[PDB]
């Protein structure tokens, strides 16, 4: 693990997944989060996002991801298959198998 910079884990380490759980405000509808849950209404296996929440969150990542974007997006594939698969089951009674999705900016 190369913990100086260009760190190979940060995103899936905690950050982007949890920012996504920071995409979480009152009305209890401020979400980019149950988007997939309404994709799982059919199994569309994808999701939409912006490029102006990260700006609404920081000014640090927007000049960062542009360097390695197509790496970030399969990092996000990993994020999803780690996250929603947590959400496939509350307590230990549900998972047939995982799968894969796409993301839309």
């Amino acid at each position: 693990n190369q913990q100086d910079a260009q760190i190979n884990l940060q995103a899936v380490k905690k950050k982007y997944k949890e920012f996504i759980r920071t995409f979480n405000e009152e009305n209890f509808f401020y979400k980019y989060r149950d988007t997939l849950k309404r994709n799982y209404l059919n199994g569309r296996y994808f999701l939409e996002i912006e490029m102006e929440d990260l700006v609404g969150f920081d000014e640090t990542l927007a000049d960062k991801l542009n360097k390695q974007p197509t790496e970030h997006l399969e990092i996000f594939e990993e994020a999803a298959r780690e996250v929603a698969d947590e959400i496939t089951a509350p307590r230990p009674e549900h998972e047939e198998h995982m799968h894969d999705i796409q993301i839309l900016l």
């Binding site: 405000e25 929440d53 609404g56 000014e59």
Partner: protein, 567 residues
């Protein structure tokens, strides 16, 4: 003061929400809250002029005793207006500075929030409403009037030595018995050197609509930080010295600093989502600095356009050559600042304060605020009044103008913002439909000398400018161009006129006018000046507006009117 009278505020009332303004809804929508706070049901009103005043209260003829006066009062000795006033209290928090003392004195249903540097109108009611000549309020040789009447003992009363009052000079004889009139006109008129110099020279305004209301409620352990942002709307409406003279601009850099550099409900836990505690920032009052590219600003700025002549190309050659000293990109100089790359928008403002030192426009930077709701956004303090006035849309459906006044009051909620961006659909396009006759003007040279001023009139309407206030802006937009830049000071600085075509409303020649450049504190004689031609002749004139600087003619009763208006 109403720390005592507010204690009274329980029974029925009317909170009229005073005539067309930003500041009204700022300083009132607060109060629909307080009334449901003390369990008061309410009713509130649109005003456009004195028309609305009694045409509605004639429908509301009760004795409802707790009554408002804001943005009003300089209309009537308002007991003369509302003769149904017997004891029905009124309430004064109006910004209209020049008001009549007849509504100050006879102080039956009025309350003076009085503190000011003008000790010049002391007995002005004690003579003006007290004197006359060729007067009948007296006894006579006839045996019918040998009784105690309203013996005012004044220029109202006799001139045959039967009058208790008038101890001002001798009553037996000065040189004769009838010199009473002579001194009466002397005493009447010699101060009207000052009195009629009041209310017949110019007009201007006072102060806020809810700054007191903040301080009124500051005692109530109320840290409704949201309401401060509601407050500043009314502040920068007309504290902005770009529009209206404040001075206190540079002296409430202490006060509201002494408010909020002081007032901190959270010194420890303020960095979270909903309405973080506010900042003061030294910023601009530039033409919508934030949300769209520089190349909107660098044309649409009067402070740029006043000094640099940017409608033409030399400005642009001057522009970019001054962007040499920054060395900004150009693609980025034609996308939104918020949309640009990041170290630029971040670093940008810091240098402009210093490298505007040498290029004739040093006074773009002022003091302001900025805050948010959440993380979709960072709204801006100054970036709010202008989207509002897109909803002040002069549609002739007969339904919009009153109703869109209500939408404004629904606007400044945190819940109601989808509507709000619709102004920005409307606002910018106005701001560049600004030029749409200007370069057709400065090169046509449609400025008219017209004697002891400068003069313009338009003769073809805009659906945009059927709505009235932009008429002042275009007036405020251009005389810099040709009249102030190609000239000397002797041949440049004079005030201006600005006509409004009503190509739809049957033809009535609406107009506003404004002072020359660098003469702001010289208040506008246009407070009266247009009475000049009207007082002499007058032809179908209106002053139906609450505003001073405002008029309405016929299609063709303006020129000989203007000919009388030469002076």
């Amino acid at each position: 003061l109403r720390n005592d009278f507010y204690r009274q505020l329980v029974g029925k009332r009317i909170l009229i929400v005073v005539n067309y303004d930003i500041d009204a809804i700022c300083a009132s929508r607060i109060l629909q809250a307080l009334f449901k706070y003390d369990h008061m049901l309410y009713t509130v009103v649109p005003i456009m002029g004195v028309t609305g005043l009694k045409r509605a209260y004639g429908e509301h003829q009760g004795d409802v005793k707790y009554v408002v006066l804001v943005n009003c009062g300089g209309c009537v000795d308002i007991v003369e207006l509302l003769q149904p006033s017997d004891d029905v209290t009124f309430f004064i928090c109006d910004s209209h500075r020049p008001l009549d003392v007849c509504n100050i004195y006879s102080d039956r249903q009025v309350c003076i929030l009085g503190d000011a540097s003008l000790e010049e109108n002391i007995p002005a009611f004690e003579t003006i409403f007290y004197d006359s000549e060729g007067e009948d309020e007296d006894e006579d040789e006839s045996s019918d009037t040998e009784q105690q009447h309203d013996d005012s003992g004044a220029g109202e009363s006799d001139q045959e030595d039967q009058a208790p009052r008038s101890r001002k000079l001798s009553r037996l004889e000065r040189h004769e018995q009838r010199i009473l009139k002579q001194r009466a006109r002397r005493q009447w008129e010699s101060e009207r050197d000052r009195i009629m110099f009041e209310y017949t020279q110019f007009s201007y305004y006072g102060r806020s609509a809810a700054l007191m209301v903040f301080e009124l409620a500051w005692k109530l352990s109320k840290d409704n930080m949201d309401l401060l942002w509601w407050a500043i709307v009314g502040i920068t409406e007309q504290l902005l010295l770009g529009k209206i003279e404040s001075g206190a601009y540079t002296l409430e850099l202490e006060q509201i600093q002494s408010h909020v550099s002081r007032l901190t409900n959270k010194t420890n836990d303020q960095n979270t989502m909903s309405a973080s505690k506010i900042t003061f920032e030294n910023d601009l009052h530039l033409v919508l600095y934030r949300h769209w590219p520089v190349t909107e600003s660098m044309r649409y700025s009067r402070y740029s356009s006043c000094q640099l002549k940017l409608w033409t190309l030399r400005g642009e050659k001057r522009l970019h050559e001054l962007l040499l000293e920054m060395g900004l990109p150009l693609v980025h100089a034609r996308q939104t600042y918020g949309a640009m790359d990041l170290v630029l928008r971040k670093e940008f403002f810091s240098m402009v304060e210093r490298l505007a030192e040498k290029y004739d426009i040093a006074d773009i930077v002022y003091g302001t605020f900025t805050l948010s709701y959440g993380y979709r956004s960072r709204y801006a303090a100054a970036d709010y009044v202008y989207a509002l006035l897109a909803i002040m849309e002069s549609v002739k459906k007969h339904k919009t103008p009153e109703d869109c006044f209500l939408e404004a009051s629904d606007a400044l909620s945190r819940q109601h913002k989808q509507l709000l961006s619709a102004g920005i659909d409307q606002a910018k396009l106005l701001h560049a439909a600004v030029f749409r006759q200007v370069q057709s003007s400065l090169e046509a040279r449609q400025v008219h000398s017209a004697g002891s001023f400068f003069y313009y009139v338009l003769q073809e309407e805009h659906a945009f400018f059927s709505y009235p206030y932009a008429l002042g802006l275009l007036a405020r937009f251009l005389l810099r161009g040709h009249v102030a830049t190609s000239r000397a000071r002797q041949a440049s600085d004079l005030p201006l006129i600005a006509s409004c075509p009503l190509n739809a409303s049957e033809g009535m020649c609406l107009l506003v006018g404004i002072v020359p450049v660098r003469e702001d504190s010289p208040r506008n004689f246009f407070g009266k000046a247009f009475e000049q031609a009207a007082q002499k002749s007058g032809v179908a004139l209106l002053q139906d507006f609450f505003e001073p600087a405002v008029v309405q003619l016929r299609q063709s009763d303006l020129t000989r009117f203007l000919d009388s208006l030469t002076v």
